[PDB]
């Protein structure tokens, strides 16, 4: 593997998370939170977008041609010309990440020298709702009927099965909007967010009000153990997985341009970032939440490294509970992992979620120097996967500091 | 025979049906899928805890729901949880894209073994746009463009360029009669996985069991004169009809790729050899130029001449496009669809591209070392373009016993 054929990140960008259908995105369509997005990487790097090889959106829930429509439509808003082909992804809720892996792998097979993995949800917009009927047929293969299974019962299912309590997740969600709430007032999530112009439109009175969109808006800094000890089970009568230690239900997106090394040094542009290795492997789809305990070793093992040599995690917060088990089966220092928060504080709009969290993952191993090398994003998915991905450290931002 | 070389081993499809009316307008989309999947683990002897990624090209249905009947599908397969799967979409050329993903993942070094798949059930998942349009797309006129009927830029393009009827027409009857001729003598035995279903009576209501076999929309008494009958569907004086159009259709395709190391190993005879892909982004208002400008870019990537391709599959989208691209580029009528196409056998979108890849490389196999150098291509919703260079494998020719 040669120097200048490194896959290497050069900017890596993100909008705010909001809430669902009550939050500052509920009246903003989906191509209008993917272009800002794509337009900032283009504008930050100086990029002719006509260079750009593929666009490959991670997203999940919407009709895909419809969606896959949108995301062209939102690449013309964004600025690039019409030679720019535009695709999407999905792997549940590891799509954004997959769309970098993707990217990363068509760079290094040669397929062009320049790409944009992206993500993309807008869970106001489209339910999570099975449509149609389920083949009868499903009865004979018990695997196939768990794929089924509604995420907050896996959550269950992985609490009680591993011994995860209460107070455990409860802990874990105060912990994720401290985090948030401290990283958001400390600025370090200005790097990443590209504030979005937008529009409130009142349901009541039909008014119509500007709004620019700068912060994640489901950060709650008044969360405890006991607010959270109030809540009630959602999926299960004497259940331990609530509203307050799940993921929220949010829209947003996230952008990622990458290219040969080699390419970045012909431009002048910094590496904030190396894609290393990725891994995508299958676990039981009942308990799928368990997705990061496996993904996490093989693509730690594939880049020749062990957990000990990983200084920063961003480990999705799908749920506390198997966001608990998994840190707790790899035993990995709680303080490496979501420093800045998780999904519980900021959402989980699903195909944004694997992209946005590069941007959270590069930014941070870039204001965290030299000695934090090595940094992994990794999510638990639907139907019984496990995502990882093991990116580097790059040295743009201390060449530029030190010029 | 570079031991790094993305190679096929394995190139599936089932038969493809018209929808809401065809032989698998009662089959679930994962019993579409299963079968191919099942094929190529069963034809090469291949422990399925061995694949890397199942990488699905499909187009119309609801994302997380589809890859969610894609997971249920590997595993009607027999393959084991761990075993990973996903869908890609880049509107009607998924199914080969999924193909290419799955040789760049390979060329990176993610897995040694994949599966490149397309499914659609067109009776399953209308065309249909939901909720409303962004105003903004009033202020793009390319994004504007994204929303136009696929047929109305097959009139687009059957205007500026000057296609005839009578030349799209005749692009339909020349594509039952090759399909008609390639099903009786056969050739489709090699590439068809038979699927097991049901099926409901239209008139009784009874529900019987059914073998598919063959591709059920070829109709061999089409002429000139049964397809001028036909009247316009996109605009009250268009030359694009239900005729001269790609049919309706449901389907699958799978491909199993790996190492070419990996496959010597195993002592598996090579098929085909991936080579180069290409996606290209082209003017939404007539995306049906798609191949003109793909497949010479993915041409001139494996260092080749137009005139170096033996054999092609361009897909058969609109006649009016179809025959311009064939015009554009200069290809031998002759080497392309030769056993027919979409227009006869159908396109189930997101089965497209990939079961294009099996049609393709069991003729070149066929036609022996002469036929070295194939081409899948298609246009694409939207305004884009692909095309995949493949190579003839070896075969037999390279193994231990050779």
């Given at each position: 593997?040669?120097?200048?054929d490194?896959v ?19 009246d ?20 002719n977008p006509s260079?750009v090889?593929?666009?490959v959106v ?9 969606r ?5 439509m939102?690449?013309?808003?964004a ?23 993707d990217?990363?792998?068509?760079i290094k ?24 009927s389920?083949?009868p ?6 695997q ?5 299974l ?5 959550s269950e ?7 995860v309590?209460?107070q455990?997740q ?18 370090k ?6 504030p ?6 009142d349901?009541?009175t039909?008014d119509?009000?500007p709004?620019?969109?700068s ?12 607010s959270?000890?109030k ?5 299960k ?20 341009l ?6 970045a ?6 590496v904030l ?6 891994a995508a492997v299958g ?27 990983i ?7 799908a ?17 490496k992992?979501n420093?800045?928060?998780g ?7 699903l ?10 993952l ?13 940094g992994?994003?990794s999510?638990?998915?639907?139907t019984?996967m496990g ?6 450290r ?10």
């Amino acid at each position: 593997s040669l120097y200048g054929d490194d896959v290497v990140i050069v900017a890596a960008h993100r909008t705010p998370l909001c809430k669902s259908k009550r939050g500052n995105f509920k009246d903003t369509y989906p191509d209008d939170l993917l272009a800002p997005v794509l337009r900032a990487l283009i504008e930050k790097t100086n990029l002719n977008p006509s260079e750009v090889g593929d666009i490959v959106v991670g997203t999940v829930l919407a009709p895909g041609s419809q969606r896959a429509s949108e995301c062209r439509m939102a690449a013309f808003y964004a600025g690039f010309p019409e030679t720019v082909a535009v695709r999407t992804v999905n792997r549940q809720c590891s799509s954004g990440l997959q769309a970098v892996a993707d990217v990363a792998a068509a760079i290094k097979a040669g397929f062009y020298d320049i790409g944009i993995g992206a993500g993309l949800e807008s869970m106001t917009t489209n339910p999570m709702a099975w449509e149609g009927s389920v083949n009868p047929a499903v009865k004979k293969f018990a695997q196939a009927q768990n794929c089924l299974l509604p995420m907050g019962v896996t959550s269950e299912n992985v609490a009680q099965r591993f011994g995860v309590s209460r107070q455990e997740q409860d802990q874990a969600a105060v912990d994720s909007h401290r985090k948030a709430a401290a990283a958001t007032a400390a600025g370090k999530f200005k790097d990443e967010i590209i504030p979005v112009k937008t529009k409130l439109v009142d349901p009541k009175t039909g008014d119509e009000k500007p709004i620019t969109v700068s912060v994640d808006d489901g950060i709650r800094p008044t969360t405890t153990l006991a607010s959270l000890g109030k809540l009630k089970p959602v999926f299960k009568k004497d259940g331990t997985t609530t509203a307050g230690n799940s993921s929220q239900v949010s829209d947003g997106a996230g952008a990622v341009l990458l290219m040969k090394r080699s390419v970045a040094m012909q431009k002048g542009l910094p590496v904030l970032g190396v894609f290393r290795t990725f891994a995508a492997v299958g676990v039981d789809p009942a308990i799928m939440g368990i997705g990061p305990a496996v993904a996490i070793p093989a693509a730690v093992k594939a880049a020749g490294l062990e957990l000990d040599d990983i200084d920063l995690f961003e480990i999705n917060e799908a749920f506390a509970s198997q966001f608990v088990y998994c840190r707790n089966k790899l035993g990995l220092d709680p303080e490496k992992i979501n420093v800045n928060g998780g999904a519980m504080a900021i959402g989980h709009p699903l195909g944004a979620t694997g992209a946005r969290c590069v941007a959270t993952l590069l930014h941070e191993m870039k204001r965290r120097g030299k000695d934090c090398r090595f940094g992994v994003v990794s999510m638990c998915i639907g139907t019984g996967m496990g995502a990882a991905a093991v990116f580097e450290r790059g040295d743009g931002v201390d060449e530029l500091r030190n010029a």
